[PDB]
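Recap quiz, item 2
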Amino acid sequence: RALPQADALKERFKAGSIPLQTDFADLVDLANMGRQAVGGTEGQTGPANGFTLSLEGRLELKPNAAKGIVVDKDGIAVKVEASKGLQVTASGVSVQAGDGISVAGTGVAVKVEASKGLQVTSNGVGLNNTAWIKMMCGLHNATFYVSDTYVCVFFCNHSTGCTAYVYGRGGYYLSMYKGDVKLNSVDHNEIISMVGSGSIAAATMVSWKSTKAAAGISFKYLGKNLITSTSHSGSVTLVAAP
Amino acid sequence: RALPQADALKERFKAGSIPLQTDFADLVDLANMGRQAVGGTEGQTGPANGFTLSLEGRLELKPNAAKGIVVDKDGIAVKVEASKGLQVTASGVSVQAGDGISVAGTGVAVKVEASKGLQVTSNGVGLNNTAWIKMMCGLHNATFYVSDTYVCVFFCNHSTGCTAYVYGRGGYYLSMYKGDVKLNSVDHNEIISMVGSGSIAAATMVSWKSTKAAAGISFKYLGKNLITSTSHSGSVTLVAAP
Amino acid sequence: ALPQADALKERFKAIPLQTDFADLVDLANMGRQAVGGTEGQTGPANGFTLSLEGRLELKPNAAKGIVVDKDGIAVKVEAKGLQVTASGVSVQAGDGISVAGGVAVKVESKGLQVTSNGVGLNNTAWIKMMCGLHNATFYVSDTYVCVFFCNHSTGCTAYVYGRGGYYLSMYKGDVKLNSVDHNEIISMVGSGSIAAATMVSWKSTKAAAGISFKYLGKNLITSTSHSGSVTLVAAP
């Protein structure tokens, strides 16, 4: 049996109606639903989980305040420990990105300055393939450099000109002959070299008394190697230190 | 006073009975429990926090939609802001780890790639103790190296052989006498050095016209120093660049 | 609105009218109204369920992070980056993460830095590098030179790199460790009498934090010499 609706139960208690035992039985069970709802009838175990019943008789929410839920006058809210990595807005709950962290579709991820030598991929954070240039710039305190497949050169302005530290690549080394190293199309004034047998010499420092190094100036050079007698003639442009 | 149960109370309105005032009081108070539960009786302040009462009289949950909770057809739910760092499954709420982040029992952590020169410890993320090898490999654009306690050497394959860039370690330097530097048991062809006193000379660049560097080849060498006249007799083997 | 309970009782005091019964029926109907059980209603509100015994029960969405148990309504965290205390839900930081006013990268002296724009190498990371390259345990660095010291046998040998356009002289007396002149030295060579020291050794002097390094720095543009006085620092 489902209890009658209100309008129907009422006309059972209309003037000049004979209210039967079963009409009162319907009234009692109707009245009893509020007590069943709060778990108060014989054989019930009290308010369901998540509910309390006050002494005034009010049904009340039981938030586990130790497990991240609070209830107040604005309603049921997630309890975020403030400034501890989490953030809540009308949009929902989210992680708050501090220094070095970025948050986007992939999730919480590492943000790096690429100018500063670091990579981040699927496999984790790491040095990129040009971190070494930044290292070498700091080593010599160079404000400009060139790099290509046969040489790299780190430029230091000083006095009326500049001096550069030189390193070979791919097996190659830098010629030290006059006319083989041009900054801004100017031949060099001085070089210091490492020496090999039979007039082989490899330029390790180069200096221009009156030519300055700046972003965009050209570097022209003759690279040599210890296996063949040929020579690459490079023409590149200076770039500011990273 | 604790209201009678439904069957007991029914019995007081049985056929032929004259219900007393106290039977009706019991009925009224039992009917009243619905109103009490929603804070509707005199002395009460209306629905408890977390609850609302519709114009139809229905009890309803009041999620604070500005603070992380939603209620829909599916139930009471945490509202996660989409793709802002957090995730939710049947297993619970979790952090979504993007590139360079890993999540484990320890918590949210940085993942570093193995061979790219980084470390992560409880003191933070830093460079590991062999990062310099990756750096020197990119500086010279080398695909192979050896490194032990007295030298490291960086190998560049070119033309019919290869040429190597040499750095001393632990106070030591590479001899440049013929027969003192062997790749694959072959003596070197040409070499480039820095000069010391008398016959002191330190190999900086070593060449083999017709021998290629490759993982597993042996590198044998005579390391020397400026304090004692003794030599170290090295025999290591080439590893690929990081 | 409906009579309060004590007003109702007066109407059923020791013959009730139909409007009294009506108020009692309507009063009794409020429990059913609340659980969405009357004609014209669609059952319990969202977030509520009604058990077969007739008890109102919460409906947590067990797949959207809420559980209800004996202890109350709770956030359901997977134990996977998150932690809940009496102060609420927060992020659990592992190795390389710090938590404070959001989630940030922590760096160790180990060459890395973190700023507004991300994690990168700092400005002295190259020192850790040249220390590992040469296996040096002490260095100096100033504007015109840097030097990496390697203790071995009875004394010390160092590798040298010029900075700012400069180079280290190799004249006896121009390079002092603990105020002692060097013994052996190895150079790159230039025109006339220009040479640049790249390895320098003291047979009976050791490197250690504190020891002074004095040197004569030179360059290729001018004839002048910087007169350097610095002190050795431990490798990072």
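The helical segments of chain A are 6-11, 21-31, 33-37, 131-140.
Chain A touches chain C through 93 residues (CB under 8 Å).
End of item.
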